[PDB]
Write a protein that holds these residues in place. Structure first.
Motif, PDB file in Angstrom:
ATOM      1  N   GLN A 178       7.977  32.291  -5.658  1.00 15.36           N
ATOM      2  CA  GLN A 178       7.987  30.861  -5.943  1.00 15.36           C
ATOM      3  C   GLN A 178       6.817  30.158  -5.266  1.00 15.36           C
ATOM      4  O   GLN A 178       6.140  29.326  -5.883  1.00 15.36           O
ATOM      5  N   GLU A 179       6.567  30.479  -3.995  1.00 18.55           N
ATOM      6  CA  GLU A 179       5.449  29.861  -3.287  1.00 18.55           C
ATOM      7  C   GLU A 179       4.122  30.221  -3.941  1.00 18.55           C
ATOM      8  O   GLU A 179       3.240  29.368  -4.086  1.00 18.55           O
ATOM      9  N   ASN A 180       3.960  31.484  -4.341  1.00 14.51           N
ATOM     10  CA  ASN A 180       2.735  31.894  -5.018  1.00 14.51           C
ATOM     11  C   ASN A 180       2.588  31.246  -6.389  1.00 14.51           C
ATOM     12  O   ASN A 180       1.459  31.088  -6.867  1.00 14.51           O
ATOM     13  N   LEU A 181       3.696  30.868  -7.028  1.00 18.84           N
ATOM     14  CA  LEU A 181       3.657  30.313  -8.372  1.00 18.84           C
ATOM     15  C   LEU A 181       3.608  28.791  -8.406  1.00 18.84           C
ATOM     16  O   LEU A 181       3.310  28.228  -9.464  1.00 18.84           O
ATOM     17  N   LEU A 182       3.890  28.118  -7.293  1.00 20.10           N
ATOM     18  CA  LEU A 182       3.910  26.659  -7.285  1.00 20.10           C
ATOM     19  C   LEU A 182       2.664  26.096  -7.961  1.00 20.10           C
ATOM     20  O   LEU A 182       1.535  26.433  -7.594  1.00 20.10           O
ATOM     21  N   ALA A 183       2.882  25.234  -8.957  1.00 21.08           N
ATOM     22  CA  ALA A 183       1.765  24.665  -9.706  1.00 21.08           C
ATOM     23  C   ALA A 183       0.864  23.832  -8.807  1.00 21.08           C
ATOM     24  O   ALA A 183      -0.366  23.905  -8.904  1.00 21.08           O
TER      25      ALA A 183
END
Lengths: 57, 103, 178, 54, 163
Positions: E87-92
């Motif tokens: 999730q942290e790596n994917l945060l827009a």
């Protein structure tokens, strides 16, 4: 009530029809105005070149 | 040499895809809200984060509060399937516009 | 030759009776729809005579609540529906039973909602038929359907009398034929 | 109820009127476009003929 | 995380609805964290096309959800070495997707407000379609390279004759 709503709906429909008809009349009138303005410009230029032809002659 | 490139491309493209997804959520919100409430527009929508096992109580409170803002003389109770036709209802209908973000 | 006549005539009689009964029932439903639409269009009809889309049909009673809910849930707050009971319950066009009915009129905005409501009614196993767009058309088509209904009733009675007569003649000698 | 009937009346009334207004605005815009293009067409044709003649 | 967007049709003014929805709800109990969406005033059109859009955005929400989840799966696969904090790596943007959404603001640059609703929908649709095609192609190529590496590893593995 059960007919008052229908009355209101039909009156609104007629209001919409009248407004679109007014828009159409404006469109037609502006089309005629465009034709007239183009013709007047044509006449202006035609007299300009008539005078130019007279000067050349 | 490619994992760094592909990983970076995925990282950048995730942001764009998520932005577009939230944009479509907003677009659906506005379209459905304007349909449900005649012009002019008033759609000060509220984004609520459900708490731990508070979904039932929150939904009940929202329904009670929205019974006035929406017509309680229809839907709510139940409805039969109308699959034949151009479209059929896919989600549950609530006394407001309801949409879910499932991050 | 005799038995071929007595069988072919009876089969043609039965088929024609079925088809004409179906047509008579459909036309009487149309007549009731026209009459009730005229009644609804009677608040104040000051004008003698196009964006709004119009439909009308008949539903089985006690389905009004579910149908109204489904309409107000699909075409969200953007379609109007008026209903009126049909006293002297009628016979179903195909289902073939005496059931109470409600004649209903639906107003809608555009093509998408037209399709929505049309499909919703078709799923609700209603029947629509056409309807007039002006009071002149309403009067004309109402008179036409009334006259056609009376003509169909006369033809139905005559054909039923013919069936009765031929069947009496058949029964007069069926045992001897057998 | 009566409130429901009134709310629906308001909703369809407003939406039909807004559809009419949108059509009117589109008609006005296309009318200005027609004004411009008709001016251009007629002026160009008459001017071409006058050029030929003169 | 699960977030619920609720219309709250004004009630004759922004305050009369939003205040009761958020502040009164929180005061009664911390049932849910309230937030304001602040949707931009788009260009509403005719109701025929508006219902058409109510169907198109019914379909496209699901399609874009599928595309985004496919991107998430591709990230979880390619970054399987360091899949922790997906999730942290994917945060827009922002710190996390939750923060981004709770502070969501429409991007006029991303979509022109003055455009029609169908036009904005098409603008989003073209981008998401390109994203899906690019994800398929690039992930397939990377998977092919990884499969070549795996075939080399398999050849190294096994008996001398088998290998």
């Amino acid at each position: 009530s059960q007919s008052q709503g229908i009355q209101q709906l039909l009156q609104a429909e007629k209001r919409a029809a009248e407004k679109v008809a007014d828009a159409r009349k404006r469109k037609a009138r502006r089309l005629k105005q465009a034709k007239e303005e183009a013709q007047m410009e044509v006449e202006q230029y035609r007299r300009e070149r008539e005078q130019e032809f007279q000067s050349k002659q | 040499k490619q994992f760094g490139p592909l990983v970076r491309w995925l990282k950048v493209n995730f942001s764009e895809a998520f932005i577009a997804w939230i944009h479509i959520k907003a677009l659906r919100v506005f379209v459905e809200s304007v349909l449900r409430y005649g012009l002019p527009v008033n759609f000060q929508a509220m984004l609520l984060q459900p708490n731990k096992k508070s979904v039932k109580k929150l939904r009940e409170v929202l329904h009670e509060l929205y019974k006035h803002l929406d017509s309680s003389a229809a839907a709510i109770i139940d409805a039969p399937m109308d699959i034949p036709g151009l479209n059929l209802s896919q989600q549950e209908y609530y006394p407001y516009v309801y949409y879910k973000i499932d991050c | 030759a005799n038995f071929e006549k007595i069988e072919n005539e009876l089969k043609e009689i039965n088929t024609n009776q079925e088809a004409l009964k179906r047509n008579f029932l459909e036309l009487t439903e149309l007549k009731f729809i026209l009459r009730k639409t005229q009644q609804f269009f009677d608040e104040m009809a000051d004008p003698d005579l196009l964006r709004l889309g119009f439909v009308a049909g008949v539903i089985n009673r006690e389905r009004i609540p579910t149908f109204e809910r489904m309409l107000w849930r699909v075409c969200r707050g953007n379609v109007f529906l008026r209903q009126a009971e049909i006293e002297n319950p009628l016979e179903d066009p195909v289902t073939g039973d005496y059931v109470h009915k409600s004649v209903f009129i639906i107003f809608f905005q555009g093509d998408q909602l037209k399709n929505r409501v049309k499909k919703i009614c078709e799923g609700f196993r209603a029947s629509l038929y056409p309807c007039p767009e002006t009071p002149q058309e309403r009067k004309e088509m109402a008179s036409g359907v009334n006259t056609r209904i009376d003509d169909l009733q006369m033809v139905l009675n005559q054909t039923e009398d013919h069936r009765q007569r031929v069947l009496q003649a058949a029964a007069k000698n069926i045992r001897v034929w057998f | 109820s009566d409130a429901d009937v009134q709310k629906q009346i308001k909703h369809m009334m407003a939406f039909i009127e807004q559809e009419a207004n949108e059509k009117a605005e589109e008609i006005d815009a296309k009318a200005e476009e027609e004004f411009n293009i008709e001016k251009g067409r007629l002026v160009q044709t008459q001017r071409l003929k006058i050029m030929e003649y003169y | 995380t699960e977030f619920w967007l609720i219309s709250a049709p004004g009630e004759k003014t922004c305050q009369q609805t939003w205040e009761k929805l958020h502040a009164a709800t929180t005061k009664n109990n911390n049932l849910a964290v309230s937030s304001k969406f602040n949707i931009p005033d788009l260009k509403v059109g005719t109701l025929d096309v508006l219902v058409g859009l109510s169907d198109e955005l019914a379909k496209l929400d699901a399609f874009v959800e599928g595309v985004v989840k496919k991107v998430a799966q591709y990230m979880a696969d390619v970054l399987e070495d360091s899949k922790d904090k997906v999730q942290e790596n994917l945060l827009a943007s922002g710190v996390d997707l939750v923060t981004y959404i709770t502070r969501f603001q429409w991007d006029m640059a991303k979509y022109p407000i003055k455009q029609s609703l169908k036009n904005i929908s098409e603008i989003i649709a073209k981008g998401v379609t390109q994203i899906d095609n690019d994800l398929k192609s690039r992930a397939s190529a990377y998977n092919n390279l990884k499969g070549n590496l795996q075939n080399l590893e398999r050849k190294n593995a096994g008996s001398l004759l088998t290998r």
